[PDB]
Ligand binder design. Structure first.
Ligand code: SF4
Ligand SMILES: [Cl-]
Ligand SMILES: [Cl-]
Ligand SMILES: [Cl-]
Ligand SMILES: [Mg+2]
Length: 305
């Protein structure tokens, strides 16, 4: 790090301790922010941590739907984010109106919503899932047909793994960050014939099918615990490469392609420091949304164990 960044890092750590904040970050945050965070993980790990933490003030570094999930789980704690416009482009593509439309079209099918969804959409869900637990959650539902959204690729992954009929909504909700080309895997196979290829379930099927492993970022981080490969090629957002290299410094981690989530990068050292200085921006939800959205979130944990 450089002298000017060094100064903000020290101030952030001092303010965090002084004001009683715990700092939660997602795996795609920039390295300088992961390094000042108290806990870094994927959505399921952040959710589980949000139910276990004891601090009264939380600074969340990620995108809005995650921050609001943490707030829904802690309605009486203060949650702040540095930039409220950090979001996911899939959120705008699924709406309460579309969910009601498809409930009417397919009555007697549960609505399973990926965590990358608005909090208002969550109030209409039967259950929430992340990419790590989507297969298990859907498997434990009684119905052989489910409505799933917004991510079509994750829904199709779930249908392959469960054999259930997964009606995805909207027509083509997808993560642009994970739209790798399958040819990139062909190329690394020739360049690194002994490497293992790990990709995200948000990837298109041709990419998933040519990979050695498919999983959430939390699952990716545990693969080198059981796979001795010297080299791993990583098909997810670039911020996870830094996470992996820090945790397993004696392996090599090659990005499948350079892929950057511009929304995840909206959080900087500068606006994270200002957030602690001003205790803003607070994450505020209508009380009815918290009331109704907590039920499908709690159900997600109930269907895991
Ligand atoms: S990486 Fe993709 S799915 Fe994740 S927040 Fe960014 S755009 Fe959304
Ligand atoms: Cl059920
Ligand atoms: Cl669409
Ligand atoms: Cl290592
Ligand atoms: Mg303020």
């Amino acid at each position: 790090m450089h002298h000017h960044h060094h100064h903000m890092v020290d101030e952030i750590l001092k303010l965090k301790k002084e004001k009683g904040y715990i700092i939660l970050a997602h795996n795609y945050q920039i390295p300088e922010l992961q390094d000042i965070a108290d806990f870094v993980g994927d959505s399921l790990q952040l959710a589980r941590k949000a139910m276990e933490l004891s601090e009264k003030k939380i600074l969340f570094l990620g995108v809005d739907f995650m921050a609001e999930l943490v707030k829904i789980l802690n309605p009486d704690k203060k949650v702040i984010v540095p930039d409220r416009s950090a979001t996911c482009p899939m959120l705008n593509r699924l709406t309460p109106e579309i969910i009601r439309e498809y409930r009417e079209k397919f009555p007697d099918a549960p609505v399973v919503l990926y965590v990358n969804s608005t909090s208002e959409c969550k109030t209409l869900a039967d259950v929430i899932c992340t990419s790590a637990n989507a297969v298990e959650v859907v498997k434990k539902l009684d119905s052989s047909v489910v409505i799933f959204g917004p991510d079509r690729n994750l829904g199709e992954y779930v249908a392959e793994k469960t054999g259930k009929k997964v009606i995805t909504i909207p027509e083509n909700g997808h993560c642009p960050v994970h739209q790798f080309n399958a040819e990139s895997i062909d190329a690394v196979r020739k360049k690194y014939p002994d490497a293992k290829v790990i990709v995200h379930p948000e990837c298109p099927k041709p990419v998933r099918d040519k990979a050695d492993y498919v999983g959430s970022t939390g699952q990716m981080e545990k693969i080198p615990e059981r796979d001795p490969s010297r080299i791993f090629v990583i098909g997810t957002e670039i911020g996870m490469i830094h996470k992996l290299k820090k945790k397993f410094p004696d392996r090599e981690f090659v990005p499948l392609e350079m892929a950057v989530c511009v929304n995840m990068k909206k959080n900087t050292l500068e606006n994270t420091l200002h957030a602690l200085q001003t205790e803003s921006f607070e994450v505020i939800l209508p009380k009815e949304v918290i009331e109704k959205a907590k039920k499908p979130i709690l159900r997600m944990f109930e269907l895991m164990g």
